[PDB]
Design an enzyme around this catalytic site. Structure first.
Site, short mmCIF file in Angstrom:
data_model
loop_
_atom_site.label_atom_id
_atom_site.label_comp_id
_atom_site.label_asym_id
_atom_site.label_seq_id
_atom_site.Cartn_x
_atom_site.Cartn_y
_atom_site.Cartn_z
CG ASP A 1 -0.18 -0.25 2.50
OD1 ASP A 1 0.43 0.71 3.02
OD2 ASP A 1 -0.20 -1.40 2.99
CG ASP B 1 3.68 -3.09 6.20
OD1 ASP B 1 2.82 -3.50 7.01
OD2 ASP B 1 3.44 -2.24 5.32
C1 LIG Z 1 -1.13 -5.04 2.10
S1 LIG Z 1 0.42 -4.52 2.88
C2 LIG Z 1 1.45 -6.03 3.15
C3 LIG Z 1 1.86 -6.86 1.90
O1 LIG Z 1 2.69 -7.97 2.27
C4 LIG Z 1 2.74 -8.76 1.07
N1 LIG Z 1 3.39 -10.07 1.33
C5 LIG Z 1 2.85 -11.18 1.96
N2 LIG Z 1 3.73 -12.15 2.00
C6 LIG Z 1 4.88 -11.74 1.41
C7 LIG Z 1 6.15 -12.34 1.15
N3 LIG Z 1 6.42 -13.64 1.54
N4 LIG Z 1 7.10 -11.61 0.51
C8 LIG Z 1 6.87 -10.34 0.12
N5 LIG Z 1 5.69 -9.75 0.34
C9 LIG Z 1 4.68 -10.40 0.97
C10 LIG Z 1 1.24 -8.88 0.72
O2 LIG Z 1 0.99 -9.24 -0.65
C11 LIG Z 1 0.70 -7.44 1.07
O3 LIG Z 1 0.52 -6.66 -0.12
N1 LIG Z 2 -5.74 -9.55 10.99
C1 LIG Z 2 -5.12 -8.40 10.57
N2 LIG Z 2 -5.81 -7.28 10.51
N3 LIG Z 2 -3.79 -8.45 10.21
C2 LIG Z 2 -3.04 -7.27 9.75
C3 LIG Z 2 -1.62 -7.72 9.34
C4 LIG Z 2 -0.60 -6.59 9.50
C5 LIG Z 2 -0.81 -5.46 8.49
N4 LIG Z 2 -0.47 -5.88 7.12
C6 LIG Z 2 0.12 -4.70 6.44
C7 LIG Z 2 -0.98 -3.71 5.99
C8 LIG Z 2 -0.52 -2.26 6.24
N5 LIG Z 2 0.52 -1.96 5.52
#
Ligand SMILES: CSC[C@H]1O[C@@H](n2cnc3c(N)ncnc32)[C@H](O)[C@@H]1O
Ligand SMILES: N=C(N)NCCCCNCCCN
Lengths: 280, 269
Positions: free
Chosen positions: A87, A161
């Site tokens: 994002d 992240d």
């Molecule tokens: C939505 S913000 C976090 C992001 O982490 C990404 N993500 C999940 N797993 C991995 C991975 N193993 N390597 C790189 N990016 C990842 C997901 O596709 C998501 O867009």
């Molecule tokens: N159950 C949940 N809501 N998990 C959220 C996972 C951590 C945020 N992902 C990255 C998104 C923001 N960059």
């Protein structure tokens, strides 16, 4: 119910709910289901596999505590690595630090970036430049972060992240990954990752902490009330070298104009329920 | 079946529920009890969550212990509200307590809590019969009560309770030294209410403090406000006395971490 509702259900039958005005889109990529809603009072909500990734009016309550503590605790964060962050919120925050010369972002699902750039737009144009290799400090790489880290080193700060450790993100919380991550860090270096809901994903948090504790020179934990997630959310920090994560450069933080994380009160960042601390 | 409490801006706290146990309309409000799938029983008042039994300590601990442990000798305590008995249970965990007066407006809340919630360890039953050793129950309005009562080392508000007149009387009701503490709503969703109370308290108390804590059952985090009379340094608590409590949430050994608060809110104080 007159209006729509989005709810993310957590273990124990607890749910985080948002009244929504409409669903903007739903797309099934090769990796996961990506959805975008227009909430009633928190802007747009991005969801992956039904879990909230962010709400545009409040996402800083997650990106600030995820990025700045580590960046301000490191003496000179010149080369940064971000895994996930499709994002663009994390890289946006990282780029606020003048010391930054290069930021490599490894996202496994390009659809997330495309969708975020077009429908979320918290990155302030950063993602588009990344998509066309036209950003001066940021470099976008589409691939698995586990593999990348297995073939790359030289990072002052590593920021993970990603999504919850279930889909392609599961190995981002594995023992071998932390070994490679530690090795990839410069001396001094700092590793940080979101670690799940403090109260409902406690097992995830505890498990990752013990694994990191066997690899990094020092491991820290902290939490922050993230808007849109079961509250509060936990974060884990892995350090290489003489970095005192208990201290941050408050003066550099003041230049960031933060809205949620308060670097002047860095000691308050370490709040954590007693019963959990006793389990560490 | 689901129970959802909606907050400003369409934010909701939801619990999957197994069954509805009770619905009673008292002279003051509608009182309902549900059994949730994974958080124990949920006590709801006018559709708002008063507490969930598997998590309520996350609210009653930070509401009570910081002030009780910061005070040098909390012998006489006042509690306004707290019909569910969680607060009085926590107060009585402190050996120095010789007397605790609880002033509740709705007797039905106490009777329903004693019979269907029962987190109070039998304290409410005793008090309803005027047979508890240290606690004394008074059915009435806390505002009018403090207008004619004084001599409290600690005053806890867990229920007009945010007016300058009330705060003036609360301060007059405190011993020297004394501590007044009140829950002050959801940090993120009732920010204005929190700020308003903070400012009114500053015009009355010798020192005013604020803090927050991750509460289970409500939009989190929850804000708390402290008003002090005398030379008490709320930034310090008796950690040794705290160890004897065996708390599950509030960590007296890391008292400095109690003051977490979003930056933009601190700047608006
Ligand atoms: C939505 S913000 C976090 C992001 O982490 C990404 N993500 C999940 N797993 C991995 C991975 N193993 N390597 C790189 N990016 C990842 C997901 O596709 C998501 O867009
Ligand atoms: N159950 C949940 N809501 N998990 C959220 C996972 C951590 C945020 N992902 C990255 C998104 C923001 N960059």
């Amino acid at each position: 119910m007159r209006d729509m509702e989005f709810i993310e259900w957590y273990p124990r039958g607890y749910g985080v709910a948002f009244k929504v005005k409409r669903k903007i889109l739903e797309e099934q990529s090769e990796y996961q289901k990506i959805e975008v809603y227009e909430t009633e009072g928190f802007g747009k909500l991005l969801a992956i596999d039904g879990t909230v990734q962010l709400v545009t009016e409040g996402e800083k309550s997650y990106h600030e505590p995820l990025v700045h503590p580590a960046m301000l605790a490191h003496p000179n964060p010149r080369r940064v690595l971000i895994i996930g962050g499709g994002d663009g919120g994390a890289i946006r925050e990282v780029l606020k630090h003048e010391e930054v010369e290069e930021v490599i972002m490894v996202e496994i699902d390009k659809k997330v970036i495309e969708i975020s750039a077009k429908y979320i737009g918290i990155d302030g144009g950063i993602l588009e430049k990344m998509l066309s290799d036209k950003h001066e400090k940021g470099k976008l790489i589409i691939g698995d972060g586990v593999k990348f880290i297995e073939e790359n080193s030289g990072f002052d700060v590593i920021i993970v992240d990603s999504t919850d450790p279930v889909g392609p993100a599961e190995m981002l919380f594995s023992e071998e990954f932390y070994k490679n991550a530690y090795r990839a860090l410069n001396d001094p270096g700092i590793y940080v990752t979101q670690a799940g809901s403090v109260y409902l994903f406690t097992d995830e948090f505890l498990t990752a902490y013990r694994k990191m504790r066997k690899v990094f020179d020092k491991v820290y934990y902290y939490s922050f009330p993230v808007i849109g997630y079961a509250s509060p959310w936990a974060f884990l920090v892995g350090v290489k070298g003489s970095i005192d994560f208990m201290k941050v450069d408050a003066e550099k933080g003041k230049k960031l104009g933060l809205e949620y994380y308060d670097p002047d009160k860095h000691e308050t960042l370490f709040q954590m329920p007693r019963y959990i601390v006793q389990m560490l």
